[PDB]
Design a protein around this nucleic acid. Structure first.
Lengths: 231, 429, 294, 333
DNA sequence: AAAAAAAAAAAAAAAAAAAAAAAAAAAAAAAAAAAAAAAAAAAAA
DNA sequence: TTTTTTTTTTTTTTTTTTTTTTTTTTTTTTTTTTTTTTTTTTTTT
């Protein structure tokens, strides 16, 4: 009998962006929707695919590793200078195969899609279609920047409990106790601080960091070697 | 009596078909049979053209020709085109016309798949076309456009199954490449048939990996002789780095003895590049605090300048000395017996079973020169970034020997990373 | 009308915690036009501060630079004003441009000129004019709060040698503060890595005096749960200058030595992102689950 | 030109399927002929945004003159910038025992008052189905008679048509498909494993030519290379009907380029087959290129986004493609 | 001998030159096509 | 049976295509030059 022909399927298909989050998300929508909430959410994930241009003029997509909130509804780590991902310029095209198969075949087969298929080998219930093509990708390969913590520096807790929290109740008391006439720009800001509950050392003038303590997010290549270009 | 001049565009394919037919039937290249088809050409012009065609197609081509030939041979016997006597006598004219006639019929089909997988494994034979060679290189990058385009594209996955090559079989394939490399630095040329150590591994796979190493230019081929390419030594001398570390365990001594005096070495001129392989680590080992020679400076009102403003005083020449609190980097290393496999098992090991010590120094320092910039490494991505140099069977015997001599420490899942004073491999005692 | 001012500021701070943050801005910039609030100058100060907080929940360069230039001008020379500017520019690399910009680095030179004018009681060539006149300084020290942010606006913009100028100027006055010694070490190393400099290894080690001075400060004079950032950041430094296995001992200290999870996700990520390049793909996926998955 | 692409889709979700009223009056005044629900108009907009993503846009849409099939195309026609043609040869199926009457819809003159700018009067219908209802034997032969007469008129009236859309009813979707492919009756399975033409509201068929190297209608051959597609709809398969639990995963088919500065691509309107998914290395086709590739799992978790597809004139639907195959290029001989 | 004016140096600022990286053009190698020559086959004496 | 003519096959030459190397342009960094102010020296009264 004429050997049976495999179903031919189109490759003219919807073309699809993709996002390689170094987060090991579960199958559940409950893991996925928060793993997206980390990388600036469902909005900025879409917009970071639209960003054309040469690779160093790309802002890229921000990934925040600590969605953790303190009980005031602040960003518990409002000091987070995020990870940066950028849109791959040389993404090869790739096609996605949806596998439709009996419920609980995953739990029956090592939670492996491969062995889930291999269990139904002789049966009519296995159903595969190519359904879309990925043609574009983002990879998060620019580091998170230096990060301070502002829980033991007193005016830093003043800032978190005021700015970070947006709590009027714990913000009015940062801004009140700001001088109009700064009486003594020479002296430790501690001289204005009511809160001695953290034992801050005398030499700490409680300078905050810049938003980029690193200027270049990929490593600046100080491999230590003698510079042949120093002339 | 189908004859070819080997200069004809079809005659090159006739030469290919005829070696496949002769070796697949009689286990040998029957040149006395093949030369009857090429009267217009010399034995050695035909050998050279054949050798060059097996080099360009490699392992993933040669077996595909043999597998299509044996599948066509099976289909021709089952359709009475071939008697087993035509196989036993090796009548190349009949077997070549039959190959030609089969292609002339398959050329007429738009090449659809069967649903049945064994029908596809019968009625396609398949050439794996090595674009992504799995040589995990991003070649000698320095620019931030080079580095950010590469490192946005590059792959972030793990194989679920064993590879399409059986890993028990691949444990001979990579071990062939390494026994070869480990003899190309030994010798400017080597002969496949006679002098290879591998021969417990099947001679077919030896020859197929020789074709692939010539395709990847790891060897030149002068007939029977593999030939040494200095590209391997050049990549060791460019990516291996051991002179810097050598002067670095020596610059450890030049810093350390002076630290407890308080009044110590003053950094007042460009200190050696190696001095930054040592001071940066030893300061990160919390041995150190840094004092200032108090060079009195003409600070004045109305003045706002930097670039040569009291010149040296914005690198005001430091004294570098013992912090009173701590020392972390003391006596951690030990006489761990060198990683030494079978007589050419791993790039360094020489024929006597001791290290080629310079190749060892260059290669361990090459691997640490990977890992300084590549911590939390598998054996596998280190095999791919070393694919021009080291297999996975080599990289374990470095990476565990560096955990035991504690220059490396390892995370979960056998990721290697170096703990501090890592450059000091070759310490004074 | 302090009751209505409280309601406007609290409502704007509440709106900005959720979607359509622009409605929060409309309340506060209306309040800056309303005489009932804006004729009380402590409330002028408070409104400009509130809207600066709100801006950091949305994300931009230009709106943020405009609100900041709007409140360093008023409330002149002022330590808390200068400090809230420098907390603000943390999240978003959109914020880096506000500091790489020449437009703000000119402002911070003119402020440093103005403080010198009022310190020595002379004119200074191209100063800003004084208006906040109780500024009093009998021991004639600098203002660290100026020195630092003028070094920042030279440090951003890749003026690394020009930034080291004003952090050597702040070293003269407040020797063992944290951010002075971190940013100064940061300037020396970012300077050092330019293509061709004479004294390039020399130019990295001055980075380490001021980084390890900030570390020895943090490790010996602060709570354990905030020594963690002395370990994280010194780790981060070695990663920025591509000495990454020295970054890893310090990232591991964030993972092993401390309870508070926050910096473990950064130390883990900046481990994962190495561990991808290094390719312990198993370990990376594992750490990713252990710290980053949900 | 010769038509290479035929799309057939069933109409949207019927208003008279809703659990509570008021059920709307049929706008034509004819028995049955009900309008869609807003949920049906949503499945129509989804279907439109799927076709809009394909470089193979329709040239035109042939609509069943029944009201709900035109209310299905009113967003499609206005989004792909195409004309709609009435074709009684793709109307509803009713049996001769159906009561109280057999519905046959009003002309262009009534439909154009509800669907202005959508419908063109340029086309005269290929045939009309039996006003006294049709047996299964009549119905199947009416569609077998339609196809050659229909396509012969399309390629004379509209000789620029290489791609066409038909929007119709459940029996009208399956019976057209089975007769185009050349099966003896509409109850036959497409294959020995028992598959059939899937036919929920807004489910999409595509029928594509075997390719050579004008042509008469009788020498042609086809494959249903997109069976009853609902993977672009929000709610998936709904109110399916056929002539007589499950779980979902995704595998990426990666095709990597060797040089990191060079990008490799999938040809417009090309075809794929897969075989041996169960094996340690499956086999694949893409256009005329062949392949084999290792089974792989990511570090981290690619998300790939159907709801963020490009345009080429609830939980948001997203794929977590943690598992993959990496196709080495593996050509035939 | 004292005072005033002019010139030179220094610190600073701004512009130009120098150095490296990227892109484009030219050169070299390889493949394909065309032309010429030789051999074989067919036809005519 | 021999000679001449036509056709086919083989070999050589020419052209096109691909790969490699060099040159040019752009960008970033470093050094030098220019300009302004202060100090020192010389000249004149």
């Amino acid at each position: 009998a004429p050997p049976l022909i495999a179903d031919e399927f189109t490759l003219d298909l919807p073309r699809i962006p993709s996002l390689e989050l170094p987060l090991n998300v579960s199958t559940k929508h409950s893991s996925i929707q928060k793993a997206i909430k980390m990388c600036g959410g469902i909005e900025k994930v879409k917009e970071a695919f639209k960003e054309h241009g040469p690779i160093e003029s790309q802002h890229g997509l921000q990934l925040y590793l600590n969605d953790d909130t303190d009980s005031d509804g602040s960003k518990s780590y409002f000091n987070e200078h995020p990870v940066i991902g950028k849109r791959v310029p040389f993404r090869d095209e790739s096609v996605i195969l949806k596998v439709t198969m009996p419920k609980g075949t995953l739990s029956k087969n090592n939670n492996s899609v491969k062995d889930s298929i291999k269990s139904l080998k002789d049966s009519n219930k296995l159903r595969v279609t190519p359904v879309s093509i990925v043609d574009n990708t983002i990879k998060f390969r620019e580091m998170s920047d230096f990060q301070i913590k502002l829980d033991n520096v007193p005016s830093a807790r003043e800032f978190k409990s005021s700015f970070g929290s947006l709590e009027w109740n714990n913000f009015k008391s940062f801004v009140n106790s700001v001088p109009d006439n700064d009486s003594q720009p020479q002296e430790n800001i501690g001289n204005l601080i009511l809160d001695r509950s953290v034992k801050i050392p005398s030499t700490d003038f409680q300078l905050p960091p810049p938003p980029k303590l690193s200027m270049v997010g990929f490593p600046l290549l100080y491999k230590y070697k003698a510079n042949p270009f120093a002339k | 009596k189908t004859v070819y001049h080997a200069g004809t565009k079809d005659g090159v394919q006739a030469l290919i078909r005829a070696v496949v037919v002769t070796k697949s039937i009689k286990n040998e290249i029957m040149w006395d049979k093949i030369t009857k088809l090429f009267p217009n050409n010399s034995l050695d012009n035909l050998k050279k053209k054949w050798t060059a065609r097996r080099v360009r197609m490699g392992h993933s081509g040669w077996r595909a020709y043999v597998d299509k030939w044996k599948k066509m041979l099976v289909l021709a016997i089952k359709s009475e085109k071939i008697s087993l006597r035509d196989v036993e006598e090796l009548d190349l004219i009949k077997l070549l016309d039959i190959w030609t006639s089969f292609d002339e019929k398959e050329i007429k089909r738009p090449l659809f798949l069967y649903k049945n997988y064994e029908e596809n494994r019968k009625k396609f034979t398949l050439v794996r076309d090595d674009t992504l060679t799995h040589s995990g290189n991003d070649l000698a990058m320095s620019s931030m456009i080079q580095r950010e385009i590469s490192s946005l594209k590059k792959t972030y996955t793990r194989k679920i199954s064993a590879s399409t090559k059986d890993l028990s079989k691949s444990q001979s394939d990579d071990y062939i490449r390494t026994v070869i490399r480990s003899i190309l630095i030994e010798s400017p040329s080597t002969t496949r048939n006679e002098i290879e150590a591998l021969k417990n591994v099947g001679n077919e796979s030896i020859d197929n990996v020789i074709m692939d190493m010539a395709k990847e230019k790891q060897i030149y081929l002068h007939g029977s002789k593999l030939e040494c390419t200095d590209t391997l030594p050049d990549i060791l001398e460019n990516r291996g780095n051991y002179k810097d570390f050598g002067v670095a365990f020596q610059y450890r001594c030049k810093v350390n003895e002076l630290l407890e005096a308080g009044n110590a070495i003053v950094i007042n001129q460009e200190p050696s590049d190696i001095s930054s392989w040592v001071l940066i680590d030893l300061i990160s080992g919390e041995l150190l605090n840094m004092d200032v020679i108090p060079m009195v400076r003409n600070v004045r009102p109305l003045t706002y300048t930097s670039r040569r403003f009291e010149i040296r005083t914005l690198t005001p020449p430091l004294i570098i000395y013992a912090n009173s609190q701590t020392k972390l980097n003391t006596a951690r290393k030990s006489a761990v017996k060198v990683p030494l496999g079978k007589p050419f098992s791993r790039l360094w090991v020489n024929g006597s079973g001791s290290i080629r010590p310079n190749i060892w120094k260059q290669v361990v320092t090459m691997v640490v020169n990977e890992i300084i910039f590549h911590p939390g490494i598998t054996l596998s991505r280190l095999q791919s970034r070393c694919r021009e140099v080291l297999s996975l069977h080599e990289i374990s015997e470095i990476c565990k020997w560096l955990l035991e001599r504690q220059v490396l420490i390892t995370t979960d899942f056998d990721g290697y990373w170096v703990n501090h004073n890592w450059y000091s491999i070759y310490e004074s005692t | 009308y302090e009751q209505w001012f409280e309601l406007f500021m609290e409502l704007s701070l509440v709106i900005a915690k959720y979607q359509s943050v622009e409605d929060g801005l409309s309340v506060v910039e209306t309040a800056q036009e309303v005489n009932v609030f804006f004729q009380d100058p402590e409330r002028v100060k408070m409104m400009k501060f509130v809207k600066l907080a709100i801006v950091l929940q949305m994300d931009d360069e230009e709106e943020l630079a405009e609100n900041l230039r709007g409140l360093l001008n008023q409330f002149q020379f002022n330590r808390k004003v200068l400090q809230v500017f420098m907390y603000s520019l943390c999240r978003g690399p959109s914020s880096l441009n506000i500091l790489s910009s020449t437009i703000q680095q000119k402002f911070f030179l003119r402020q440093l000129k103005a403080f010198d004018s009022c310190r020595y009681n002379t004119e200074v060539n191209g100063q800003a004019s004084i208006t906040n006149k109780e500024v009093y300084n009998p021991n004639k020290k600098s203002s660290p709060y100026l020195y630092y942010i003028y070094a920042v606006l030279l440090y951003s913009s890749r003026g690394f040698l020009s930034a080291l100028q004003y952090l050597t100027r702040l070293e003269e006055d407040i020797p063992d503060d944290p951010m002075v010694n971190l940013l100064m070490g940061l300037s020396h190393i970012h300077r050092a890595m330019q293509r061709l400099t004479a004294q390039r290894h020399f130019q990295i080690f001055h980075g380490l005096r001021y980084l390890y001075r900030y570390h020895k400060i943090r490790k010996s004079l602060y709570t354990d749960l905030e020594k963690q950032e002395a370990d994280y950041n010194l780790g981060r430094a070695f990663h920025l200058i591509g000495l990454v296995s020295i970054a890893i001992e310090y990232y591991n200290r964030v993972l092993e030595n401390y309870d508070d999870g926050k910096l473990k996700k950064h130390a883990a990520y900046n481990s994962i992102i190495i561990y991808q390049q290094s390719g312990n793909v198993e370990l990376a996926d594992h750490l990713m689950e252990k710290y980053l998955s949900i | 030109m010769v038509v290479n692409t035929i799309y057939i889709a069933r109409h949207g979700y019927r208003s008279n399927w809703l659990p509570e009223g008021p059920y709307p009056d049929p706008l034509t005044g004819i028995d049955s002929d009900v309008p869609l629900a807003e949920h049906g108009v949503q499945q129509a907009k989804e279907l439109a945004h799927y076709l809009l993503s394909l470089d193979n846009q329709p040239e035109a849409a042939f609509a069943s003159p029944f009201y709900r099939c035109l209310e299905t195309v009113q967003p499609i026609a206005k989004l792909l910038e195409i004309p709609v043609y009435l074709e009684r040869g793709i109307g509803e199926w009713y049996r001769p025992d159906r009561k109280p009457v057999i519905p046959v819809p009003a002309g262009y003159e009534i439909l154009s008052k509800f669907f202005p700018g959508v419908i063109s009067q340029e086309w005269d219908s290929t045939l009309t189905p039996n006003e006294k209802g049709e047996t299964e034997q009549e119905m199947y032969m009416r569609f077998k008679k339609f196809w050659p007469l229909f396509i012969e008129r399309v390629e004379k009236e509209y000789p620029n048509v290489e791609c066409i859309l038909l929007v119709t009813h459940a029996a009208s979707k399956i019976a057209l498909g089975m007769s185009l492919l050349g099966y003896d009756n509409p109850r036959m399975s497409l294959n020995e494993n028992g598959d059939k033409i899937r036919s929920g509201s807004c489910s999409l068929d595509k029928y594509e030519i075997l390719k050579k190297s004008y042509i008469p209608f009788s020498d042609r051959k086809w494959v249903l290379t997109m069976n009853g597609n609902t993977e672009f709809l929000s709610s998936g398969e709904e109110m399916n009907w056929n002539f007589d639990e499950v779980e979902t995963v995704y595998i990426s088919v990666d095709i990597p380029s060797g040089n990191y500065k060079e990008r490799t691509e999938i040809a417009k309107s090309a075809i794929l087959q897969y075989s041996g998914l169960e094996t340690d290395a499956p086999l694949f086709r893409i256009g005329n290129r062949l392949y084999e590739g290792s089974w792989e799992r990511l570090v981290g978790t690619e998300l790939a986004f159907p709801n963020a597809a490009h345009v080429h004139k609830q939980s948001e639907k997203i794929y977590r493609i943690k598992e993959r195959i990496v196709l080495s290029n593996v050509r035939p001989m």
